[PDB]
Each structure stands twice: as structure tokens, then as C-alpha cells.
Design a protein around this ligand. Structure first.
Ligand code: HEM
Ligand code: HEM
Ligand SMILES: N=C(Nc1cccc(COC[C@@H](CN)OCc2cccc(/N=C(/N)c3cccs3)c2)c1)c1cccs1
Ligand SMILES: N=C(Nc1cccc(COC[C@@H](CN)OCc2cccc(/N=C(/N)c3cccs3)c2)c1)c1cccs1
Ligand SMILES: C[C@H](O)[C@H](O)[C@H]1CNc2nc(N)[nH]c(=O)c2N1
Ligand SMILES: C[C@H](O)[C@H](O)[C@H]1CNc2nc(N)[nH]c(=O)c2N1
Ligand SMILES: [Cl-]
Ligand SMILES: [Cl-]
Lengths: 362, 362
């Protein structure tokens, strides 16, 4: 059954991929080679063209992503050649540097060796390559609560956080054959952070908020033609609401709305005053302003939905079925001000795609 | 098949209804009577208790409604006795008066004779008993675009609107046996309207916005135990976002955000300024303020979600399955500031319930 799933997925992917690449005539001979390779080795190896286009197709198929207009300009870095933890670390350091690109963010994915017998070659523990630690003990909450369990796991491995609200977690990953992951501190010169200030309200800096420039998701599995790339960190740029309406706002994250209300000079006493809504708008204006001022890429939710509409039109004109998750595509502020809110989307799963996988800790 | 559907639906409803009413022992004899009645007449007649509780269950089962905490205090008016259009008109006038209750809105439903052979006894054309007309011709848009087709149909029946932005549509309904509906102008003394002003920004009244106090949905079918009450207008009070984030804001409704931006003194030039979001917040603060100032019931989305959470807890403690439509329950502004956004809901259809039915015009 193993190899059968593999061969069926391989067939569908190659045919589709080669169609899109105008390599339709080469499908027959390539599939034959693959059939042998699977027969003899239990798996097959993607060409650089297949791997690159596969990762792009996977992005294009991500139902929850509003940023898909730009799927075809994804920068694919092939690191299937890595064998050592020093090589993995340096590849992750490099991904951060080249994706950051001095603020002009380049959507990038680095692809490590794939699973074999469902056996991982490289196992990344980080949720994102750059993320803040979280601590909770005896009433005392510090940092990002979403990072509490990973932070606790790192502190089992000999690492110790400073316990500021913005400790950078180290890279943490395990190699096949090793019982424990290794950890490496991020060189701070590689990490761009943005202090949050407001265009009009000088007091806003009293909150001493900041966020990191580049979200690099490092815990999802990229699946291409039956091959499971469990280690394939990718990044785009932020949509501002992710930071302003969720990471800094959620009660189970940084929970800053009451403090925002105070510094913008409004009462946080009555639901009917819509103080949370107003705080959310000003915090979100501040985030966009700050990223712009710092020269770091970011998109607002209005422009992002406008781009997503173009992606819908592109799919229709290319004759491709469009899939999407309405519940994730709508932005968490003013969703009815976007076209997304007013239509529906088929949430069918199409491969290649990115998938959740079980955490190696907890 | 007709009567079979009826008998099966009747059985399920009576058993459930009588359970809830502690009338469990009376189920057997009541179902026997019903079986005879269906056998002989092709239908059955609800007791006043059944009808009242049925309408309440139908509200409780409305997946899209955030206001369901209060399902058991619904005021049910039984007008199955009506036979003439004067009686229907006076019943609708009365519903408006008693539901309005001088501003202290009473959730009410008036129930007219049900369908027979799928044959309507009373056919209501209005979407809501109180609603503004809409006109569109030669570039010129006036009033509420959502009312354009009904307005056009009324003007086929001898009625003529003043063509202000807030013309009250007349009541319009058809009696069984009549080929055309009749129309009646609403007595203005019955209709409370609220001028929209802002608590802090005096210029806001320059927009000359207003809305009506009581939304009374008059085009949905109430289904109870296999009986189809196609004419059963109901009302609650508004959640403020319905007026501020949708009726006055949508581009295909009153489309007021650019004018809001201007009167609150902000530019409407850059997406990154979040001017639409800020305009939405101030317009929504204004709506809540104005309804409160006028002594007309309204709820903000934060309080409404807080009430809905209690409804969820009530269902769990009563041992009832909770059903809901996440896509409708989330408010159209700051949805992630409500608990609703962060959980999921089973969207299964449970009866009794309210259902869409085909419009009698267009
Ligand atoms: C170019 C800039 C991009 C923007 C602005 C963007 C925007 C977003 C946003 C706002 C989300 C929702 C995240 C959340 O609410 O937590 C999302 C989800 C997602 N994006 Fe994108 N994205 C971009 C690029 C990419 C790239 C380069 C990939 C992969 C190659 C990708 C794949 C995904 C996936 C898989 C999800 C779903 C995550 C999940 O289910 O947990 N996106 N995107
Ligand atoms: C007591 C105050 C009430 C509030 C604040 C409330 C709130 C709401 C809101 C905000 C919606 C969504 C409407 C939209 O977006 O267009 C809704 C939908 C609904 N409500 Fe309620 N509601 C209330 C009372 C009632 C009552 C009394 C009934 C019936 C007896 C009812 C039945 C429904 C139904 C059927 C829908 C769905 C309409 C559709 O699918 O088009 N609600 N409610
Ligand atoms: N939900 C489960 N697991 C799970 C638990 C907690 C968290 C998560 C994953 O969180 C998804 C989101 C958080 N909203 O992750 C952040 C994210 C994902 C994708 C894009 C994001 N933003 C961006 N702009 C980008 C990053 C990289 C490229 S673009 C940001 C998953 C399950 C439980 C049981 C079965 S599945
Ligand atoms: N959608 C269809 N029909 C359709 C077309 C246009 C409009 C509609 C119905 O609109 C539903 C909404 C508009 N958002 O109606 C307003 C509404 C409904 C329910 C509650 C509302 N607000 C309230 N607070 C209340 C009113 C009465 C009691 S509470 C307000 C239905 C279909 C097309 C094909 C199959 S179904
Ligand atoms: C397509 C989508 O279902 C549609 O825009 C819905 C979204 N959620 C909604 N929710 C409410 N309360 N009212 C609405 O009219 C809508 N519109
Ligand atoms: C339960 C619900 O699906 C959950 O709260 C979702 C809603 N939509 C979302 N949409 C985005 N973009 N990100 C999220 O984390 C969530 N959370
Ligand atoms: Cl994030
Ligand atoms: Cl309405």
C-alpha cells in the first residue's frame, strides 16, 4: 500500500507539473523511470524543476492563504544535500538572511531531505525560525504564551532565556540518529525587528512594543507527488492584522488592547464605546506605519484582499479550480470591507500542499 | 409521501415539545388524535402551547442567530384566525406597535394561517415590515439598493415613492384567491426612527443619516412539526454592526464610509491608513450612541457575543446539542475580539426552524 500511494501520487503530480511546464511529451518516459526507482528503492527523487514547481503548486493550493497571487515567484532553495547539523544550521541562517534581504522580503523556501520510511532526516522543532519565548509560572506571565511549551522544552536542553517579553528562541532541530535536538542561538545581526510607534500619537512608544520582521514557518510538511518534505521552512511577509489584531491583541497572546486604549486616551470601561475596536484600529495603523518606516515589507488587509481577488481572476482565466478556506481568508478586522467576506470558497484539499504534522515535543 | 412527511415531522416535534414542557405522558394520546386528523383532513392543527413553544424552539435552532440566549421569552401572537386583508393589515400594524413598545423592544412573532396544499393563505411580499425603498435609473441611485426590486413591484401596484433616501415602503401582501397583492402605507406614528449622531463629533449630523428602530423579518417560513407557517413575521432588536457595518457601510447598500471619513476629519486616500476601518468604528459608535440616546433597544457585538456564550453554556447544561453557523455568528467588525471567532460550531439543521422561501415577485 505504501508504494502504491506513492506511485499514484507521483503519476498525478508529474502529469500536472509537466503540463504546466509545457513538458507534456516527457511525462511517459519520466513516469517509467520513476516506476523503476520506486520498484527498486521504495521511493523516487525529484528533479530540481519538479521540486521547485511542486513547492510553488503547494503554495498555490494553500486554501488558508490570502497571499497566493505571488505563488509563481517563490524562491526555492534546494538543500536536499545536507547531512550534518552544522549544514542544517547554516542553511537556516542563510534562509533568514536571504529572505530578509535588508527588509525587502523575498518569499523563500528551503527544502531539506524528505522522509524515507516515514523516517525524518531532519526534524525541526521551531514553529517559526524567528519567534519570541514565553514563560508562565506562579501567576507570572512573560513573553509569548504561544511559545510556552517550546520554551520549556528548550530549557530542558541547557538553554536559558533572559525572560524579557521578547527573547529570541534559539534554532532547535534533531538529526536522524540523534536522540536529542541541538540548539543554536540566532545571530542578532540576522534578525530585523520593528519597534511599534504610531504616526500621530507620540505616547504609543511608551508601550515598548516590537515585532520581528520575517515570519518563517518551519513546522509544516510540504508534500509533493507522494514525497514528504517534513522539513521545508518557508516565509512570505506579514499582513499587518496578523501582528496588530492577533499576536499583540489576543488575550492568550500579548493581550495589549487595554494598554493601547490607555495610551490613545480612551476609556476601556463600556462595551458600547467600542473601545476594543478603536484600540485594534490604532494598533493596526501603528504596525503598518512602523514596518513602512523601518523599510520592512508588509501588506495591509485591504491591499492583500485586492491582490487575492486578482489571484481568483488569474485562476479562472488559467482554467484552474480555485480552492479556499473562507474562515481563514477573511481578515480579523473589517472583514466585510473585503470582497472575500461576500463570496464563498470550495475548501477541497488539492496536492501538492503544506500540511500540519505532529510536534516532536510536549 | 406528503402526509407521511407530515406524520413523521409531527411525531418528532410533539415528543420533543411535550418533553420540554413536562407533558411527556400526554404524547401518546395527542399523537393518536393527530394521526386521525391527518388521515381525515390531510393536516393537523397545533394547540396554542405547541405553536408558542414551536416558535421558540425554531428561534433556538436558528444557526445564524447570535441573539438566541433569549429564545424562551419570545412573545408569540396567534393570528391563525385571520381571514380578511383588513385583519392581516391590522395584525401587522399591531405587531409593529407592540414590538416597538415605545423603544423598549419586545421580541415578538405574529403567526398567520399556515399553508394547506402548499397553498398560501396569506403571502407577505415585504422583506421586513419596516424598510426603506430603493431606486436606480440612469446613473441615479436613491435609497436602499437592496429594496430596488420590491420598490419596483410596488410602483406597479399604484404606489409611488417620494424618492428620498429613506422612503418607508408600504405593507404589501396577497390573500389566497386574490391575483394581486394589496398595499397599505405605514402610519408614521407607529414607526420609530433614530437620527444618527456621534457622541464627540458634532459634524456627524451633517451626513443626515438615520435608521428605523425595529427590524421585523416578514419573508421567512416558520416550520413546526410539518406545518408550514409561510407568513409569520418576527422581530428582535438590532445588533449595532448590522446597521453600522453593513446597511450603512456596504458598497451595495448606503455606501457611506467615504462620507464618514470626511466628517471625522481623516483622509480616505491610502489603504495603509486603515481609513475604512476607522470610519467603520466611528460610524458604529455613532449608531450605538444614537439608539441609546433615543431610548431604543440595541446591543453591541461584544455584549451580544457575551450573551451568546451564555446561550452555549445553557445548552450544555440542559443537555442539548448546540448548532451554529460560524460564518454568520462572527460580527463583521473585530470578530477575533469575540470568543465565537475562536471556536467552531456544528451547522446541522434542526427543526422547528425558520427557512428561506421563494419571493412572490421578480
Ligand atoms: C508573500 C506574502 C504572504 C502573505 C502576505 C501571506 C498571508 C497569509 C496569511 C495572513 C495567512 C494566515 C495566517 C494566520 O492567520 O495565522 C497565511 C496562511 C498561509 N500561508 Fe500565506 N502569505 C504569504 C506567503 C506565503 C508563502 C510564501 C507560503 C508558502 C510557500 C504560504 C503558505 C501559507 C500557508 C500554508 C498558510 C496556512 C497556515 C496554516 O494553516 O496554519 N504563504 N498566509
Ligand atoms: C433579541 C434580539 C436579537 C438579536 C440581537 C439578534 C441578532 C441577530 C443577528 C445579528 C443576525 C444576523 C443578521 C444578518 O447579518 O443579516 C440574526 C439572524 C437571525 N436571527 Fe436573530 N436576533 C435577535 C432575535 C431574533 C428573533 C426574535 C428571531 C426569531 C424568532 C431570530 C431569528 C433569527 C434568524 C432566523 C436569523 C437568520 C436570518 C437569515 O438566515 O437570513 N432572531 N440574529
Ligand atoms: N490546530 C492544530 N494544531 C495547531 C495548534 C496550534 C497552532 C497551529 C498553527 O497555527 C497557525 C498559524 C497561527 N494562527 O501560524 C502562523 C502563520 C501561518 C502561516 C502564515 C503566517 N503568516 C505569514 N504571513 C507567513 C508565514 C510564512 C509564509 S507567509 C503565519 C496548529 C490541530 C489540533 C488537532 C489537529 S490539528
Ligand atoms: N440567499 C438567498 N436568498 C436571499 C437573498 C438576499 C437576501 C436574503 C436574506 O438576507 C438575510 C439578512 C440580510 N443580511 O436579512 C436581514 C436580517 C435577518 C435576520 C435578522 C436580522 N436582524 C435582527 N436583529 C432581527 C430581525 C428579526 C429578528 S432579529 C436581519 C436571502 C438565496 C439564493 C439561492 C438560494 S438561497
Ligand atoms: C458569502 C458569505 O457567506 C456572506 O458574505 C455572509 C458572511 N457572513 C454574514 N454574516 C451575517 N451576520 N450577515 C451576512 O449578511 C453575512 N454574509
Ligand atoms: C475556530 C476558528 O476556525 C479559528 O478561530 C480561526 C478563525 N480564522 C482564522 N483565520 C486566520 N487567518 N488565522 C487564525 O488563526 C484563525 N483562527
Ligand atoms: Cl505570526
Ligand atoms: Cl437589517
Amino acid at each position: 500500500e505504501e508504494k502504491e500511494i506513492l506511485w499514484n501520487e507521483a503519476k498525478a503530480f508529474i502529469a500536472a507539473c509537466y503540463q504546466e511546464l509545457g513538458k507534456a511529451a516527457e511525462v511517459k518516459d519520466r513516469l517509467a523511470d520513476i516506476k523503476s526507482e520506486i520498484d527498486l528503492t521504495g521511493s523516487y527523487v525529484h528533479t530540481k524543476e519538479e521540486l521547485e514547481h511542486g513547492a510553488k503548486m503547494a503554495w498555490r493550493n494553500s486554501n488558508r492563504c490570502i497571499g497566493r497571487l505571488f505563488w509563481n515567484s517563490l524562491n526555492v532553495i534546494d538543500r536536499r544535500d545536507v547531512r550534518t547539523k552544522e549544514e542544517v544550521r547554516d542553511a537556516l541562517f542563510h534562509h533568514i538572511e536571504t529572505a530578509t534581504n535588508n527588509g525587502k522580503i523575498r518569499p523563500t523556501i528551503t527544502i531539506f531531505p524528505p522522509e524515507e520510511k516515514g523516517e525524518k532526516q531532519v526534524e525541526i522543532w521551531n514553529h517559526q525560525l524567528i519567534r519570541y519565548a514565553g514563560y508562565e509560572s506562579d501567576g507570572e506571565r512573560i513573553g509569548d504564551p504561544a511559545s510556552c511549551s517550546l520554551t520549556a522544552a528548550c530549557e530542558e536542553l541547557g538553554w536559558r532565556g533572559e525572560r524579557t517579553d521578547f527573547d529570541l528562541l534559539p534554532l532547535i532541530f534533531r538529526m536522524k540518529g540523534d536522540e536529542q535536538p541541538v540548539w543554536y542561538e540566532l545571530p542578532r545581526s540576522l534578525v530585523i525587528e520593528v519597534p511599534i510607534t504610531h504616526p500621530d500619537i507620540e505616547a504609543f512608544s511608551d508601550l515598548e512594543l516590537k515585532w520581528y520582521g520575517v515570519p518563517i514557518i518551519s513546522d509544516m510538511k510540504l508534500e509533493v507527488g507522494g514525497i514528504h518534505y517534513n522539513a521545508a521552512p518557508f516565509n512570505g511577509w506579514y499582513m499587518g492584522t496578523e501582528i496588530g489584531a492577533r499576536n499583540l491583541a489576543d488575550e492568550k497572546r500579548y493581550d495589549k488592547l487595554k494598554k493601547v486604549a490607555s495610551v490613545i486616551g480612551i476609556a476601556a470601561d463600556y462595551n458600547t464605546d467600542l473601545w476594543k475596536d478603536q484600540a485594534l484600529v490604532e494598533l493596526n495603523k501603528a504596525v503598518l506605519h512602523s514596518y513602512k518606516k523601518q523599510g520592512v515589507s508588509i501588506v495591509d488587509h485591504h491591499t492583500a484582499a485586492s491582490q487575492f481577488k486578482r489571484f481568483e481572476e488569474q485562476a479562472e482565466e488559467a482554467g484552474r479550480k480555485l480552492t479556499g478556506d473562507w474562515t481563514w481568508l477573511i481578515p480579523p478586522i473589517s472583514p466585510a470591507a473585503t470582497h472575500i467576506f461576500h463570496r464563498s470558497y470550495d475548501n477541497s484539499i488539492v496536492k501538492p500542499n503544506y500540511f500540519y504534522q505532529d510536534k516532536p515535543y510536549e
